Design a protein around this ligand. Structure first.
Ligand SMILES: O=C(Cc1ccccc1)Nc1cccc(-c2nc3sccn3c2-c2ccnc(Nc3ccc(N4CCOCC4)cc3)n2)c1
Length: 265
């Protein structure tokens, strides 16, 4: 259920954006035997990170091409050349981070709280599949429509400001560390794409954490919301909430958004 592509079957057409893992293109799939060309999204990765062999790269692709959840972006094809190219269904909206920045203060409670639930449902799917994301951030949550988001790049500098303490201290990555990152993601959303710890150098993040300081309460959040975010940042991984609890809690809040998020509008 993963299409291995030959450069002859597709073609990048325009650059749509660039980040750390690589560049995003609008592309076209040329089905052989036909006169049409089908739009696709191609993500060309920045290689040379630890020069891996292709069969070792495909082993992984096959797993990401195996996900089935409405809130998890699935790998559809892969083209292994000089560079590694990931193909998926093209969406018109790109990442949640930019989306929320573009709609800075004109986004409503219902939307925020729903993205929170959707992100948790996606994360809970991955947990059930025994997959650890490692870099869950709003930049990694794609928008299919403004009411339907999909998490991407599970298993792909170090996002210190998104990492749980143990990942920082020991490079320990678990579903519980994904919970931490999830709380940061929620925080980005609630602040409309603000940079976590604006100003503080990464080098100093372990110490402020250790000393018990946490990301500040977003002005739009009530204490119940902030309380949840904060629970995601406990030092003791096992005392952090589970994604299934998170789905439930946010589901409840989304049932009466205006009560849990205070936005002028
Ligand atoms: O194969 C997989 C699964 C996976 C799971 C586990 C491990 C590895 C891979 N994932 C994947 C594949 C291909 C691209 C990507 C991607 N990575 C990113 S970051 C942002 C957007 N994407 C996409 C993206 C994707 C599709 N379609 C669009 N469409 C689209 C529409 C507007 C824009 N714009 C940018 C400028 O302003 C807004 C308009 C930009 C793009 N994007 C992800």
């Amino acid at each position: 259920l993963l299409r291995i592509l030959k450069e002859t079957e597709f073609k990048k057409i325009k650059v749509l954006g660039s980040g750390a893992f690589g560049t995003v293109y609008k592309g076209l799939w040329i089905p052989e035997g036909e006169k049409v060309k089908i739009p696709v999204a191609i993500k060309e990765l920045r290689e040379a990170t630890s020069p891996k062999a292709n069969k070792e790269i495909l082993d992984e692709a096959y797993v990401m091409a195996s996900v089935d959840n409405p809130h998890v972006c699935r790998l559809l094809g892969i083209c292994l050349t000089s560079t590694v190219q990931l193909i998926t269904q093209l969406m018109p909206f790109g990442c949640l981070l930019d989306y929320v920045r573009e709609h800075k203060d004109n986004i409503g409670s219902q939307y925020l709280l729903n993205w929170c639930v959707q992100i948790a449902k996606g994360m809970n799917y991955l947990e059930d599949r025994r997959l650890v994301h490692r870099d869950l951030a709003a930049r990694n949550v794609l928008v299919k429509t403004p009411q339907h988001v999909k998490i991407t790049d599970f298993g792909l500098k170090v996002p210190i400001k998104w990492m749980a303490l143990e990942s920082i201290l020991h490079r320990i990555y678990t579903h519980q560390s994904d919970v931490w990152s999830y709380g940061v993601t929620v925080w980005e959303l609630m602040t409309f794409g603000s940079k976590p710890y604006d100003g503080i150098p990464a080098s100093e993040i372990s110490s402020i954490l250790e000393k018990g300081e946490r990301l500040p309460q977003p002005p739009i959040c009530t204490i119940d919301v902030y309380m949840i975010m904060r629970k995601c940042w406990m030092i003791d991984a096992d005392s952090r909430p589970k994604f299934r609890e998170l789905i439930i809690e946010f589901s409840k809040m989304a049932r009466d958004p205006q009560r849990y998020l205070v936005i002028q509008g």
